[PDB]
Every structure is written in C-alpha cells, then in structure tokens.
Design a protein around this nucleic acid. Sequence first.
DNA 1: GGCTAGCGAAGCTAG
Length: 257
Amino acid sequence: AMKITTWNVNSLNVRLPQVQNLLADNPPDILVLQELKLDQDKFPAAALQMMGWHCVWSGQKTYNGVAIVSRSVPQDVHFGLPALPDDPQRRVIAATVSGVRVINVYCVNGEALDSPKFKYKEQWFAALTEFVRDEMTRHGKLVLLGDFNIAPADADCYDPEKWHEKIHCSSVERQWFQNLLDLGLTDSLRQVHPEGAFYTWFDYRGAMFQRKLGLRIDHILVSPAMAAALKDVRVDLETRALERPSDHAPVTAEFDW
DNA sequence: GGCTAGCGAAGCTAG
C-alpha cells in the first residue's frame, strides 16, 4: 500500500499550517509541493522534521519552488533537468522513496500563447520529456506528478469554447502532455474516473471555486507497474474550501502493493 | 478580472 499527494500551495509560508494539518489528518506516505515561493534557506524544515517527516526541496526567492516530504528517506535526489542546465528556475526535483521514483514538477505556466514564456514552456517540456524517458529506463515504478499547467482534454475545462486555443488548453500544449503519456505513463485519475469533471485549480477571481468552474491541471502520471497497482485517485476539495486557500486542490493517488 | 501573494512600503509581476 502507498498513498501519494501533490499540492500546489501558492507560497508555503502562507499555507504551512494547512500543510501540517494535511500531514497529521489522513497522512499520505509522500507529499510533493509546488510554488513554495521561498529561498533554499527559508524552507520550514524544523517544523516538518519535528512531526517526523524527511524533506528534500529546491527553492529560490519569490517564485517557483518544489519539495518532497515523506516518512521514509528520499534517496538519490536529483535537481533540475539535464537538457536545460542553465535554467535557474527551481521547478524539478526527483528522489526514490521506498522503491518508487518520484519526479515532482512545477511546470511552466506560459502566461499566453504569444508570450515569450510560452516558448520557454515549449523548451522546458521538451527538456522534461527527455529526462523522464531516461529515468524510466532505470525505475520500473515511477510517478511523474505535480502542476502541469495543462488541461488534457475538454472535459478538463469548464468552458472549452471560451478557452479555445487559450493558455493551458491549446492543442500544442495538449500535444506536449501527450508526449509525456507516450513514454508509457498513465493519467492515473482518468484510469479511475474516465468521465466527469475533476478540476484541480479554481481562479481566485469571480468566486470560481464556489461556482465549481475550474481546470484539471494537477496530475499524477504513473508507470505501467504503478498503473496496475492503482486503486483510487481523488481531488481534495475540502482543502480548497478552507479560509484563505490555495487556488489549487491537492490530488491523492492510492496504490496497493 | 473585477483575487492573491511577494516585495516592500507604492504600485507593479506573476500566477
């Protein structure tokens, strides 16, 4: 049995009490975080270590930031993407926890399709694809998870016509997501729930969460051996409903052996 | 768009 959770916290300094409540009440074996928004030396390691968790993280000031939190020691920690060595943005950290290779990604948002950040998103997803491909030659049990900032299909967007060829929903972004699936990875939540709306992000503006209008952009992609052990995937909307929430909801995948 | 958070002390960027 194994329980893994991904959560974009949108600044861990703000969301730390909710992260700790998440770890005490129904704990996962592994919790990965995105957008820590704090430098390498500002991570709250002591607060999480005192509760019995091992922490590895990659941080920078103000932006980005990724972390892996587990009860067992995370081994062979890799930082970044080898095909993109000069990129200072801290978006990728990978470690092996209990025989499972965990790759935590805070994928590039892109801002808009005509934004220079969209070409950066293009290069970045190309660099990510080569990294996961090389990693998958070594680890039969592998999980690529995090904030992909890509809604895979129209069932993952509350208004597909309004979002036609818009950021997160464009057909080229959906090809990049498909390029990751073509490595042998499974959209774990669509294997459990082939149909229905399972949005993970709700815009802060216009009370979009109360209207239940959002996107599914936080995913858990698993290798064939992990897919055969998959039993459930859920989106935790209770946490999204808390006072002063993150705009993302946590996603938890459960495996058995 | 019409929040939120960071930086820093005011509006900007970024999400």
